[PDB]
Coordinates of C-alpha atoms in Angstrom, one line a residue:
Chain A
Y301 CA -13.3 58.6 4.8
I302 CA -10.5 56.6 3.2
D303 CA -8.3 57.0 0.1
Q304 CA -6.7 53.7 -1.0
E305 CA -4.2 54.0 -3.9
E306 CA -2.4 50.7 -3.0
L307 CA -4.5 48.9 -5.6
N308 CA -1.5 49.4 -7.9
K309 CA 1.9 49.6 -6.1
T310 CA 4.0 47.1 -7.9
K311 CA 5.7 48.7 -10.9
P312 CA 6.1 46.6 -14.0
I313 CA 9.6 45.2 -14.1
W314 CA 10.3 43.3 -17.4
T315 CA 10.7 46.5 -19.4
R316 CA 13.8 48.2 -17.9
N317 CA 17.4 47.9 -19.1
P318 CA 18.8 44.6 -17.9
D319 CA 22.2 46.1 -17.0
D320 CA 20.9 48.7 -14.5
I321 CA 19.2 46.1 -12.2
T322 CA 20.2 45.1 -8.7
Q323 CA 19.2 42.0 -6.8
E324 CA 17.1 43.5 -4.0
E325 CA 14.4 44.9 -6.3
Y326 CA 14.0 41.4 -7.7
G327 CA 13.6 40.4 -4.1
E328 CA 10.7 42.7 -3.3
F329 CA 9.0 42.0 -6.7
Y330 CA 9.3 38.2 -6.0
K331 CA 7.8 38.8 -2.5
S332 CA 4.6 40.2 -4.0
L333 CA 3.9 37.2 -6.3
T334 CA 3.5 34.5 -3.6
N335 CA 3.0 35.7 0.0
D336 CA 5.8 34.0 1.9
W337 CA 8.7 34.7 4.3
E338 CA 11.6 33.9 1.9
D339 CA 13.4 35.2 -1.1
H340 CA 14.3 33.5 -4.4
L341 CA 17.5 31.6 -5.4
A342 CA 18.1 32.5 -9.0
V343 CA 16.5 34.6 -11.8
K344 CA 16.6 34.7 -15.6
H345 CA 15.7 37.5 -18.0
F346 CA 16.1 37.7 -21.7
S347 CA 14.1 38.4 -24.9
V348 CA 13.9 37.5 -28.6
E349 CA 13.5 40.5 -30.9
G350 CA 13.1 38.3 -34.0
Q351 CA 10.2 38.0 -36.4
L352 CA 8.4 37.1 -33.1
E353 CA 8.4 39.8 -30.4
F354 CA 8.1 39.0 -26.7
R355 CA 10.0 38.9 -23.4
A356 CA 10.1 36.5 -20.5
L357 CA 11.1 36.4 -16.8
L358 CA 11.7 33.2 -14.8
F359 CA 12.5 32.5 -11.1
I360 CA 13.9 29.5 -9.2
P361 CA 12.2 28.9 -5.8
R362 CA 14.3 27.8 -2.8
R363 CA 11.9 25.3 -1.2
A364 CA 9.9 22.9 -3.3
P365 CA 6.1 23.7 -3.4
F366 CA 4.3 21.3 -1.1
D367 CA 1.3 20.8 -3.5
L368 CA 2.6 19.5 -6.8
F369 CA 1.2 15.9 -6.6
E370 CA -2.3 16.9 -7.7
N371 CA -3.9 15.8 -11.0
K372 CA -6.1 18.4 -12.6
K373 CA -6.3 21.5 -10.3
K374 CA -6.0 24.9 -11.9
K375 CA -2.3 25.1 -12.7
Chain B
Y451 CA -21.4 -10.5 -10.5
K452 CA -18.3 -12.8 -10.3
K453 CA -17.1 -11.7 -13.8
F454 CA -17.9 -8.0 -13.1
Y455 CA -16.3 -7.9 -9.7
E456 CA -13.0 -9.4 -10.8
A457 CA -12.6 -6.7 -13.5
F458 CA -13.6 -3.3 -12.2
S459 CA -13.2 -3.6 -8.4
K460 CA -10.5 -1.0 -8.5
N461 CA -13.0 1.7 -9.5
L462 CA -15.4 1.0 -6.5
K463 CA -12.6 0.7 -4.1
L464 CA -11.3 4.1 -5.2
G465 CA -14.7 5.7 -5.2
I466 CA -15.5 4.7 -1.6
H467 CA -12.4 6.7 -0.6
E468 CA -13.3 10.1 -2.1
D469 CA -17.0 10.8 -1.9
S470 CA -19.3 12.0 0.9
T471 CA -22.9 12.2 -0.3
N472 CA -23.1 8.5 -1.2
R473 CA -20.9 6.3 1.1
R474 CA -23.3 4.2 3.2
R475 CA -25.2 3.2 0.0
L476 CA -21.9 2.0 -1.5
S477 CA -20.9 0.0 1.6
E478 CA -22.4 -3.3 0.5
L479 CA -21.1 -4.0 -3.1
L480 CA -17.8 -5.3 -1.8
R481 CA -17.0 -9.0 -1.8
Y482 CA -14.2 -10.6 0.2
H483 CA -12.7 -13.9 1.2
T484 CA -13.5 -15.0 4.7
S485 CA -12.4 -17.8 6.9
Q486 CA -15.6 -19.9 6.3
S487 CA -15.5 -19.9 2.4
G488 CA -12.6 -21.7 0.8
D489 CA -12.9 -20.4 -2.7
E490 CA -16.1 -18.2 -2.8
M491 CA -16.3 -14.5 -2.1
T492 CA -18.6 -13.5 0.8
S493 CA -20.6 -10.3 1.1
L494 CA -20.1 -8.2 4.2
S495 CA -23.8 -7.3 4.4
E496 CA -24.7 -11.0 4.4
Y497 CA -21.9 -11.4 7.0
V498 CA -24.0 -9.3 9.4
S499 CA -26.2 -12.3 9.7
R500 CA -24.2 -14.8 11.7
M501 CA -22.3 -13.4 14.7
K502 CA -22.4 -14.3 18.4
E503 CA -24.4 -12.2 20.8
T504 CA -21.9 -10.6 23.2
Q505 CA -19.5 -9.9 20.4
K506 CA -18.9 -6.2 19.3
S507 CA -17.5 -4.9 16.0
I508 CA -16.1 -6.9 13.0
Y509 CA -12.6 -8.2 13.0
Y510 CA -10.3 -7.9 10.0
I511 CA -6.7 -8.3 8.8
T512 CA -4.6 -6.8 5.9
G513 CA -1.7 -8.7 4.4
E514 CA 0.6 -9.0 1.3
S515 CA -0.4 -12.4 -0.1
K516 CA -3.3 -14.8 0.2
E517 CA -1.4 -17.7 1.6
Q518 CA 1.0 -15.5 3.6
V519 CA -1.9 -14.2 5.6
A520 CA -3.9 -17.4 5.5
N521 CA -1.9 -18.8 8.3
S522 CA -0.6 -15.9 10.5
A523 CA 0.7 -16.0 14.0
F524 CA -1.8 -13.5 15.4
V525 CA -4.8 -15.4 14.1
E526 CA -4.0 -18.7 16.0
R527 CA -5.9 -17.5 19.0
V528 CA -9.0 -15.8 17.6
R529 CA -9.5 -18.8 15.2
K530 CA -9.9 -21.4 17.9
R531 CA -13.0 -19.8 19.3
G532 CA -15.1 -20.1 16.1
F533 CA -15.4 -16.4 15.2
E534 CA -15.3 -15.0 11.7
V535 CA -12.6 -12.8 10.1
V536 CA -11.9 -11.3 6.6
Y537 CA -8.8 -10.7 4.6
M538 CA -8.1 -7.4 2.8
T539 CA -4.7 -8.1 1.2
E540 CA -4.2 -5.4 -1.4
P541 CA -2.7 -1.9 -1.4
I542 CA -6.0 -0.1 -2.0
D543 CA -7.6 -2.2 0.7
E544 CA -5.8 -0.1 3.3
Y545 CA -7.0 3.1 1.7
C546 CA -10.6 1.8 1.9
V547 CA -10.4 0.5 5.4
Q548 CA -8.6 3.6 6.7
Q549 CA -11.5 6.0 5.9
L550 CA -14.6 3.8 6.5
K551 CA -15.0 3.1 10.2
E552 CA -18.6 1.9 10.6
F553 CA -21.2 -0.4 9.2
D554 CA -24.8 -0.5 10.5
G555 CA -24.0 0.4 14.1
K556 CA -20.8 -1.6 14.2
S557 CA -17.0 -0.8 14.3
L558 CA -14.1 -2.0 12.2
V559 CA -11.1 -3.1 14.3
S560 CA -8.1 -5.0 13.1
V561 CA -6.0 -7.5 15.1
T562 CA -2.9 -5.4 15.5
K563 CA -4.2 -2.3 17.2
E564 CA -2.9 -1.8 20.8
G565 CA -3.9 -5.1 22.3
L566 CA -7.6 -5.9 21.6
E567 CA -9.5 -7.8 24.3
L568 CA -12.6 -10.0 23.9
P569 CA -15.3 -10.8 26.5
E570 CA -15.0 -14.3 27.9
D571 CA -15.2 -16.5 30.9
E572 CA -14.3 -15.2 34.3
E573 CA -11.8 -17.7 35.6
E574 CA -9.2 -16.9 33.0
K575 CA -9.0 -13.3 34.4
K576 CA -7.4 -14.4 37.7
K577 CA -4.6 -16.6 36.3
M578 CA -3.7 -14.0 33.7
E579 CA -3.5 -11.2 36.3
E580 CA -1.4 -13.6 38.4
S581 CA 1.0 -13.8 35.5
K582 CA 0.9 -10.0 35.4
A583 CA 1.7 -9.7 39.1
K584 CA 4.2 -12.5 39.2
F585 CA 6.3 -11.7 36.0
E586 CA 6.9 -8.0 36.7
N587 CA 10.7 -8.3 37.2
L588 CA 11.5 -10.1 33.9
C589 CA 9.3 -7.6 32.1
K590 CA 11.1 -4.9 34.1
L591 CA 14.7 -5.9 33.5
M592 CA 14.3 -6.8 29.8
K593 CA 13.8 -3.2 28.7
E594 CA 17.2 -2.2 30.0
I595 CA 19.1 -4.4 27.5
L596 CA 16.8 -3.3 24.6
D597 CA 17.4 0.4 23.9
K598 CA 14.8 2.7 22.6
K599 CA 13.2 0.7 19.9
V600 CA 10.0 -0.8 21.4
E601 CA 7.5 1.1 23.6
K602 CA 6.1 -1.7 25.9
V603 CA 6.0 -5.5 26.2
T604 CA 3.0 -7.2 27.7
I605 CA 1.1 -10.5 27.8
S606 CA -2.1 -10.4 25.7
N607 CA -4.3 -13.0 23.9
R608 CA -3.2 -13.6 20.3
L609 CA -0.4 -16.2 20.9
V610 CA -0.9 -19.9 21.3
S611 CA 1.9 -21.4 19.1
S612 CA 4.5 -18.6 18.8
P613 CA 6.5 -16.9 21.5
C614 CA 6.6 -13.3 20.2
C615 CA 4.9 -10.9 17.9
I616 CA 4.8 -7.2 17.0
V617 CA 1.8 -4.9 17.0
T618 CA 1.4 -1.2 16.1
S619 CA -0.3 1.7 17.8
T620 CA -3.6 3.5 17.1
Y621 CA -2.2 6.9 16.3
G622 CA 0.3 6.0 13.7
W623 CA 0.9 4.1 10.5
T624 CA 0.5 0.4 9.8
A625 CA 2.9 -2.3 8.4
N626 CA 1.5 -2.7 4.9
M627 CA 1.2 1.0 4.2
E628 CA 4.7 1.4 5.6
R629 CA 5.6 -0.4 2.3
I630 CA 3.0 1.3 0.1
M631 CA 4.7 4.6 1.1
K632 CA 8.3 3.4 0.5
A633 CA 7.3 1.8 -2.8
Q634 CA 5.5 5.1 -3.8
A635 CA 7.7 6.9 -6.3
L636 CA 7.0 10.7 -6.1
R637 CA 7.1 11.5 -2.4
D638 CA 9.1 13.6 0.0
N639 CA 11.6 12.3 2.4
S640 CA 10.8 14.6 5.4
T641 CA 7.6 12.8 6.4
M642 CA 9.1 9.7 8.0
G643 CA 10.2 11.7 11.1
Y644 CA 6.7 12.2 12.5
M645 CA 4.1 9.6 11.8
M646 CA 6.0 6.4 12.0
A647 CA 4.0 4.3 14.4
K648 CA 5.6 3.4 17.7
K649 CA 6.1 -0.4 18.1
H650 CA 4.8 -2.9 20.7
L651 CA 6.2 -6.3 21.5
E652 CA 4.0 -9.2 22.7
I653 CA 5.3 -12.3 24.5
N654 CA 3.7 -15.7 25.1
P655 CA 4.2 -17.1 28.7
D656 CA 3.4 -20.7 27.4
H657 CA 6.4 -21.6 25.4
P658 CA 9.0 -23.2 27.8
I659 CA 11.7 -20.8 26.5
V660 CA 10.2 -17.9 28.5
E661 CA 10.2 -19.9 31.7
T662 CA 13.7 -21.2 31.1
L663 CA 14.7 -17.5 30.9
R664 CA 13.5 -17.0 34.5
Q665 CA 16.1 -19.3 36.1
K666 CA 19.0 -17.5 34.5
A667 CA 17.2 -14.2 35.2
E668 CA 17.2 -14.7 39.0
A669 CA 20.4 -16.7 38.7
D670 CA 22.6 -14.4 36.6
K671 CA 22.2 -10.7 36.9
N672 CA 23.6 -10.0 33.4
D673 CA 26.0 -11.6 30.9
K674 CA 26.7 -12.2 27.2
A675 CA 24.3 -15.1 26.7
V676 CA 21.2 -13.2 27.7
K677 CA 22.1 -10.4 25.3
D678 CA 22.7 -12.8 22.4
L679 CA 19.5 -14.7 22.9
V680 CA 17.3 -11.6 23.4
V681 CA 18.7 -9.8 20.3
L682 CA 18.3 -13.0 18.3
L683 CA 14.7 -13.6 19.3
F684 CA 13.8 -9.9 18.8
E685 CA 15.3 -9.7 15.4
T686 CA 13.5 -12.9 14.4
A687 CA 10.3 -11.4 15.7
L688 CA 10.9 -8.3 13.6
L689 CA 10.6 -10.5 10.5
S690 CA 7.4 -12.3 11.9
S691 CA 5.2 -9.2 11.3
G692 CA 6.3 -8.5 7.7
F693 CA 9.0 -6.0 8.7
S694 CA 12.2 -5.9 6.6
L695 CA 15.5 -5.5 8.4
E696 CA 18.1 -2.9 7.5
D697 CA 21.2 -5.0 7.9
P698 CA 20.6 -8.5 6.7
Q699 CA 24.2 -9.4 7.1
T700 CA 23.8 -9.1 10.9
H701 CA 21.2 -11.9 11.0
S702 CA 22.8 -13.9 8.2
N703 CA 26.0 -14.1 10.3
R704 CA 23.9 -15.2 13.3
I705 CA 22.3 -18.0 11.3
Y706 CA 25.6 -19.1 9.8
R707 CA 27.3 -19.1 13.2
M708 CA 25.6 -22.3 14.3
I709 CA 25.4 -24.3 11.1
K710 CA 29.2 -24.8 11.5
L711 CA 28.5 -26.3 14.9
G712 CA 26.0 -28.4 13.1
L713 CA 28.8 -30.5 11.5
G714 CA 31.1 -29.9 14.5
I715 CA 34.7 -28.6 14.4
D716 CA 34.9 -24.9 13.5
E717 CA 38.7 -24.9 14.0
Chain C
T583 CA 9.6 -4.8 -22.3
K584 CA 6.6 -2.5 -23.0
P585 CA 7.7 0.2 -20.5
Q586 CA 5.7 2.6 -18.4
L587 CA 5.5 6.1 -16.8
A588 CA 5.4 7.3 -13.2
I589 CA 2.2 7.5 -11.1
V590 CA 1.3 9.9 -8.4
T591 CA -0.2 9.5 -4.9
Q592 CA -3.6 10.8 -3.6
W593 CA -3.3 12.6 -0.2
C594 CA -2.6 12.0 3.5
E595 CA -4.4 12.3 6.8
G596 CA -3.8 15.1 9.2
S597 CA -3.7 14.9 13.0
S598 CA -6.1 16.4 15.5
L599 CA -5.8 19.4 17.8
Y600 CA -7.2 18.7 21.2
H601 CA -4.8 15.8 21.7
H602 CA -2.1 18.4 21.6
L603 CA -3.7 20.3 24.5
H604 CA -3.3 17.6 27.2
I605 CA -0.8 14.9 26.3
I606 CA 1.8 15.9 23.8
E607 CA 3.1 19.5 23.5
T608 CA 6.2 19.5 21.2
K609 CA 6.7 23.2 21.9
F610 CA 8.4 25.5 19.4
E611 CA 8.4 29.3 19.6
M612 CA 5.1 31.1 19.9
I613 CA 5.5 32.6 16.3
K614 CA 4.1 29.3 15.1
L615 CA 1.1 29.7 17.4
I616 CA 0.4 33.2 16.1
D617 CA 0.7 31.8 12.5
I618 CA -1.9 29.2 13.4
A619 CA -4.1 31.9 14.8
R620 CA -3.9 34.0 11.6
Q621 CA -4.6 31.1 9.3
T622 CA -7.6 29.9 11.4
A623 CA -9.0 33.5 11.7
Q624 CA -8.7 34.0 7.9
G625 CA -10.5 30.6 7.3
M626 CA -13.4 31.2 9.7
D627 CA -13.8 34.7 8.4
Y628 CA -14.0 33.4 4.9
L629 CA -16.6 30.8 6.0
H630 CA -18.8 33.2 7.8
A631 CA -18.5 35.8 5.0
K632 CA -21.3 33.8 3.1
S633 CA -23.7 34.3 6.0
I634 CA -22.8 30.8 7.3
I635 CA -23.4 29.7 10.8
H636 CA -21.3 27.0 12.5
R637 CA -23.3 26.0 15.6
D638 CA -20.1 24.6 17.1
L639 CA -16.3 25.0 16.8
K640 CA -15.2 22.6 19.5
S641 CA -11.4 22.4 19.7
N642 CA -11.6 18.7 18.5
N643 CA -13.1 20.0 15.2
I644 CA -9.6 21.0 14.0
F645 CA -7.3 18.8 12.0
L646 CA -3.6 19.9 12.0
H647 CA -2.7 18.9 8.4
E648 CA 0.7 19.1 6.7
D649 CA 2.9 21.7 8.4
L650 CA 0.6 23.8 10.5
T651 CA -2.8 24.0 8.6
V652 CA -6.3 23.9 10.0
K653 CA -9.0 21.8 8.6
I654 CA -12.4 22.4 10.2
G655 CA -14.3 19.3 11.3
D656 CA -18.0 19.0 12.4
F657 CA -18.5 15.5 13.7
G658 CA -17.8 14.5 17.3
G677 CA -12.4 24.0 26.0
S678 CA -15.8 25.5 25.4
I679 CA -17.8 22.4 24.7
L680 CA -19.9 23.3 27.8
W681 CA -18.8 26.9 28.1
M682 CA -21.2 28.6 25.6
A683 CA -23.3 31.6 26.6
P684 CA -26.6 31.0 28.5
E685 CA -28.1 31.7 25.0
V686 CA -28.1 27.9 24.6
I687 CA -30.0 27.6 27.8
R688 CA -32.4 30.2 26.4
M689 CA -35.3 28.0 25.0
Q690 CA -37.6 30.9 24.1
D691 CA -38.8 31.4 20.5
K692 CA -36.6 28.3 19.7
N693 CA -34.1 30.6 17.8
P694 CA -31.5 32.0 20.2
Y695 CA -28.8 31.3 17.6
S696 CA -26.7 34.2 16.5
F697 CA -23.2 35.2 15.4
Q698 CA -22.4 36.6 18.9
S699 CA -22.1 33.1 20.4
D700 CA -19.7 32.1 17.6
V701 CA -17.6 35.2 18.1
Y702 CA -17.4 34.7 21.9
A703 CA -16.6 31.0 21.4
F704 CA -13.8 31.8 19.0
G705 CA -12.4 34.3 21.5
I706 CA -12.4 31.9 24.4
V707 CA -11.1 29.0 22.4
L708 CA -8.2 30.9 20.9
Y709 CA -7.4 32.4 24.3
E710 CA -7.3 28.9 26.0
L711 CA -5.4 27.4 23.1
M712 CA -2.7 30.1 23.6
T713 CA -3.0 29.4 27.4
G714 CA -2.8 25.6 27.1
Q715 CA -5.0 24.4 30.0
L716 CA -8.6 24.1 31.0
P717 CA -10.6 26.6 33.0
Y718 CA -13.1 25.3 35.6
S719 CA -11.7 21.8 36.4
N720 CA -12.1 21.8 40.2
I721 CA -15.8 22.4 40.8
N722 CA -18.2 20.5 38.5
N723 CA -21.9 20.3 39.3
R724 CA -23.9 20.6 36.1
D725 CA -27.3 21.0 37.8
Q726 CA -25.9 23.4 40.4
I727 CA -24.0 25.3 37.7
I728 CA -27.2 25.8 35.7
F729 CA -29.1 26.8 38.8
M730 CA -26.4 29.3 39.6
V731 CA -26.6 30.5 36.0
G732 CA -30.3 31.1 36.6
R733 CA -29.4 33.5 39.4
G734 CA -26.0 34.4 40.8
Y735 CA -24.0 33.9 37.6
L736 CA -20.2 34.0 37.9
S737 CA -17.4 36.0 36.2
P738 CA -14.2 34.7 34.5
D739 CA -11.1 34.4 36.7
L740 CA -8.5 37.1 36.2
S741 CA -5.5 35.4 37.9
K742 CA -5.5 32.8 35.1
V743 CA -3.7 34.8 32.5
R744 CA -0.4 34.4 30.6
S745 CA 2.5 36.6 31.4
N746 CA 3.3 37.4 27.7
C747 CA -0.2 38.4 26.8
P748 CA 0.1 40.7 23.7
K749 CA -1.2 44.2 24.3
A750 CA -3.4 44.4 21.2
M751 CA -5.0 41.0 21.9
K752 CA -5.5 41.7 25.6
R753 CA -7.2 45.0 24.7
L754 CA -9.4 43.3 22.1
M755 CA -10.5 40.5 24.5
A756 CA -11.1 42.9 27.4
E757 CA -13.1 45.2 25.1
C758 CA -15.2 42.3 23.6
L759 CA -17.5 41.8 26.6
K760 CA -18.4 44.8 28.8
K761 CA -22.2 45.0 29.3
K762 CA -23.9 43.0 26.5
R763 CA -22.7 40.3 24.2
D764 CA -24.3 42.0 21.2
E765 CA -22.1 45.0 20.4
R766 CA -19.2 42.8 19.4
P767 CA -17.2 44.1 16.4
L768 CA -17.3 42.6 12.9
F769 CA -14.6 40.2 11.7
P770 CA -12.2 42.0 9.3
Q771 CA -11.1 44.7 11.8
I772 CA -10.3 41.8 14.2
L773 CA -8.2 40.4 11.3
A774 CA -6.6 43.8 10.8
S775 CA -5.7 43.9 14.5
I776 CA -4.2 40.4 14.1
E777 CA -2.2 41.4 11.1
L778 CA -0.9 44.7 12.6
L779 CA 0.1 43.0 15.9
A780 CA 1.9 40.3 13.9
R781 CA 3.6 42.7 11.6
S782 CA 4.5 45.1 14.3
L783 CA 6.7 43.0 16.7
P784 CA 9.1 40.6 14.9
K785 CA 12.0 42.2 16.7
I786 CA 11.6 45.9 16.0
Chain D
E601 CA 15.6 -22.7 -13.5
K602 CA 19.4 -23.0 -13.6
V603 CA 22.4 -23.4 -11.2
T604 CA 26.0 -22.5 -12.1
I605 CA 29.2 -21.1 -10.7
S606 CA 30.7 -17.7 -11.3
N607 CA 33.2 -15.1 -10.0
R608 CA 31.2 -12.8 -7.7
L609 CA 31.6 -14.2 -4.2
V610 CA 34.3 -14.3 -1.5
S611 CA 32.5 -15.3 1.7
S612 CA 28.9 -16.1 0.8
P613 CA 27.8 -19.7 0.3
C614 CA 25.3 -18.7 -2.4
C615 CA 23.8 -15.7 -4.1
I616 CA 20.9 -15.1 -6.5
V617 CA 20.9 -13.5 -10.0
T618 CA 18.2 -12.2 -12.4
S619 CA 17.8 -12.9 -16.1
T620 CA 19.1 -10.7 -18.9
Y621 CA 15.5 -9.8 -19.6
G622 CA 13.9 -9.4 -16.2
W623 CA 13.3 -6.8 -13.5
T624 CA 15.7 -6.8 -10.6
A625 CA 14.8 -7.4 -7.0
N626 CA 14.0 -3.8 -6.0
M627 CA 12.3 -3.1 -9.3
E628 CA 9.9 -6.0 -9.0
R629 CA 9.2 -5.2 -5.3
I630 CA 8.5 -1.5 -5.9
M631 CA 6.4 -2.3 -9.0
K632 CA 4.2 -4.9 -7.3
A633 CA 3.9 -3.1 -4.0
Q634 CA 2.2 0.0 -5.4
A635 CA -1.6 0.7 -5.6
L636 CA -3.4 0.3 -8.9
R637 CA -1.0 -2.5 -9.6
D638 CA -3.2 -4.1 -12.2
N639 CA -1.5 -7.4 -11.4
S640 CA -4.1 -9.4 -13.4
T641 CA -1.7 -10.2 -16.3
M642 CA 1.5 -8.2 -16.0
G643 CA 2.1 -9.5 -12.5
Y644 CA 2.3 -13.2 -13.7
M645 CA 5.0 -12.5 -16.3
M646 CA 8.3 -11.3 -14.9
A647 CA 11.1 -12.0 -12.3
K648 CA 13.0 -15.0 -13.6
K649 CA 15.8 -16.2 -11.3
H650 CA 18.9 -18.3 -11.1
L651 CA 21.5 -19.3 -8.5
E652 CA 25.3 -19.5 -7.9
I653 CA 27.6 -21.1 -5.4
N654 CA 31.0 -20.3 -4.3
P655 CA 33.4 -23.3 -4.3
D656 CA 35.5 -21.8 -1.5
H657 CA 33.5 -21.8 1.7
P658 CA 34.3 -25.2 3.3
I659 CA 30.6 -25.7 4.1
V660 CA 30.0 -26.4 0.4
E661 CA 32.9 -28.8 0.3
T662 CA 31.7 -30.8 3.3
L663 CA 28.2 -30.7 1.8
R664 CA 29.5 -32.2 -1.5
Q665 CA 31.6 -34.9 0.2
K666 CA 28.5 -35.8 2.3
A667 CA 26.2 -35.9 -0.7
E668 CA 28.7 -38.0 -2.7
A669 CA 28.1 -40.8 -0.1
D670 CA 24.3 -40.9 0.2
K671 CA 22.1 -40.0 -2.8
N672 CA 18.7 -40.0 -1.0
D673 CA 19.6 -38.6 2.4
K674 CA 17.2 -36.7 4.7
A675 CA 19.2 -33.7 6.2
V676 CA 20.3 -32.7 2.7
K677 CA 16.9 -31.4 1.6
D678 CA 16.1 -29.3 4.7
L679 CA 19.7 -28.0 4.8
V680 CA 19.7 -27.0 1.1
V681 CA 16.2 -25.3 1.3
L682 CA 17.3 -23.5 4.5
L683 CA 20.4 -22.1 2.7
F684 CA 18.3 -21.2 -0.4
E685 CA 15.7 -19.3 1.7
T686 CA 18.3 -17.5 3.7
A687 CA 20.1 -16.3 0.6
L688 CA 16.6 -15.5 -0.7
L689 CA 15.9 -13.2 2.2
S690 CA 19.3 -11.5 2.2
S691 CA 19.0 -10.6 -1.4
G692 CA 16.1 -8.1 -1.5
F693 CA 13.3 -10.7 -2.3
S694 CA 10.4 -11.4 -0.1
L695 CA 9.5 -14.9 1.3
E696 CA 6.1 -16.4 0.6
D697 CA 5.4 -17.8 4.1
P698 CA 7.4 -16.3 7.1
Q699 CA 5.5 -18.5 9.6
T700 CA 7.1 -21.7 8.3
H701 CA 10.5 -19.9 8.3
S702 CA 10.2 -18.8 11.9
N703 CA 9.0 -22.3 12.8
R704 CA 12.2 -23.8 11.4
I705 CA 14.4 -21.5 13.3
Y706 CA 12.4 -22.0 16.4
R707 CA 12.7 -25.8 16.2
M708 CA 16.4 -25.5 15.5
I709 CA 17.1 -23.3 18.5
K710 CA 14.9 -25.5 20.6
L711 CA 16.8 -28.7 19.6
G712 CA 20.1 -26.9 20.1
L713 CA 18.8 -26.1 23.6
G714 CA 18.1 -29.9 23.9
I715 CA 14.6 -29.7 25.1
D716 CA 12.9 -32.5 23.1
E717 CA 9.6 -34.1 24.2

């Protein structure tokens, strides 16, 4: 037999209080978005609780992606 | 077909690059200018008609301008024997010729690929190898003064009216795409390290200059004059194959150095 | 006067593999070799996952593209080293996944090793007659010093009695991934 | 098209300049040397050029005092075209026929060596 719970292991991250956040956890979360051997360089978190409601999270990779000169692949 | 081919040739030349199911079928709708038709395009399929018997594979060249390639230093040997060649002088022509490598049992080989040889009469073999076995020391001692730029210098058969020329290697890039890549806008700058093609120099032991070098070679072991003459001739040869120098002042000074002797008194 | 906008490229050619085996090495640390192994194993597993045969994976059929990336070729170390299953010409269908598994094993082992087995004695007719009766066994002295324990155990366990009870691909992949992510330094 | 004198040179006999409405050397080269050039019409439109001379390098002064004597001389034409082409090469442009160029330098060095026949 086998029991496999790892189908969901990455906890959602864009909901917590911005102040209580360290850098390492950003590190592990960024690891499990693109399988690689490196960390990020900068991050950005904010939100706009206006008449529109939403939130966003952005990263800045260290090394440029090698495949950006395509034309119409699935972006 | 003349008015059609002048307009939408870009589409076919691109399509031949990226497709696999239908490539052999598309290998005949191309029209080129050959060295038997002054101002008329010639089909390559119809070209398959008239070749010699012992010959193998089609011969071709790629250049930058029609006239610039029309009279090139390499050709002056393969043109005297009555063969037939074609000119693909356009950036996409390199893309087409790079991928396609065959046509109806034949091969596509260009002039500047690691010293091509053509079958011919027997008696020329012995004199050429005599030049091989007699001119080993000048070929030996010239590599010392030239540091690690060229790979090898030899005597081959593409030169009848020019002393020197430059040819590339099989595993590597070619001269015209060396400029298609620099002229390309959105590209990385880490790729030049690896697949630059190593360079080969070719000498002609017919021009009296090379023989005049021999007397000072066995006469003087080394001095300033040999260094000056060799760097001058090499830098001139670098221009001969469409290569662009990195320090034009260095050669401009060397060309201005003697025009002052032309009228006499420098000082 | 009527400006413009930038234009992009198309793509570039990669280099081969087998050329690297004899002439030019350009040796970095073996981590790159293990990375090559894991990408190529993943690729061939994906290919075979759709019940797809290959009928050959000769070491020249690999193009080392940008960085270290394998592109599998088809057109023209184990080019004469397949099982006598090829020599079997009974029922005209000896083809099976077992030959592909064994060929991948020997090819990757030699690619790690870096040099050719069986280069001293070469007699095709006598080799095949000896295959008929008195078949040989692989040499054991020809082995690398730093042979990883997991891979050594896998390759030793692959062929014991019959070349038919070989394992199935993803546990090989799991062994690859555990051995890779079990010895970076710690 | 035009020839004039300006203040841009200290040690060069001549240099080349572009028009106020015209692509520079590198721009024209990079534009024409890229695939999908579509050179059918746009190619035959741009790259106007001019020329300048410094009145300081004594070569131009001796050239002028030679030309004031003979108005239909022989060495004047090949000398001036040689200077024009050399400034052309050492300015970012590309020559139309390198073979003739190399031929001129080859004959020059040969005659300097005094070979003849």
